[PDB]
Design a protein around this ligand. Sequence first.
Ligand SMILES: [Fe+2]
Length: 186
Amino acid sequence: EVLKPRTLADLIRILHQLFAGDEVNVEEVQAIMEAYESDPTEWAMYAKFDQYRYTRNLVDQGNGKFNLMILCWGEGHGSSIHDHTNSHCFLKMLQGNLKETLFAWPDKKSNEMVKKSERVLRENQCAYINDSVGLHRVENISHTEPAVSLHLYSPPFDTCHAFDQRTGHKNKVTMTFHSKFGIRTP
Ligand SMILES: [Fe+2]
């Protein structure tokens, strides 16, 4: 019953429609992202890995309304606990599996951070987060296989905060692209 993009290109085209206004239906975007069947023939040009850390690969600049990117998680790669700078954030599995750990926000006092939820994102599953949902850390479940995910942020942002799990203290971090439109950007 959901509009089903047959190709990554269809998906991008639909996303341009859904983010053209000032209202974004979160469940609708989520269902449409989820309905696209990951096809590595279509996104291999973006799947540029690094040995030591996950990479961010810009697919589409969404006419300033959103950023669409592909994250490549090597064996055992994972993120810090982080926020998402007041944007809508969608993340869809394209290959492998990611564990998402949702964390509560620290307050002023120093303290071990508190897990609110833990799950594995299944094949083609699209999850959603924003700052009001919580913080999270995302990581490849596998030490023998990669994971690949498709992330949509609206509006785009390129800074966020990383949090120390032991204290809740945070650091601003500039986020960078490993590649854009399939072209390395070193
Ligand atoms: Fe995130």
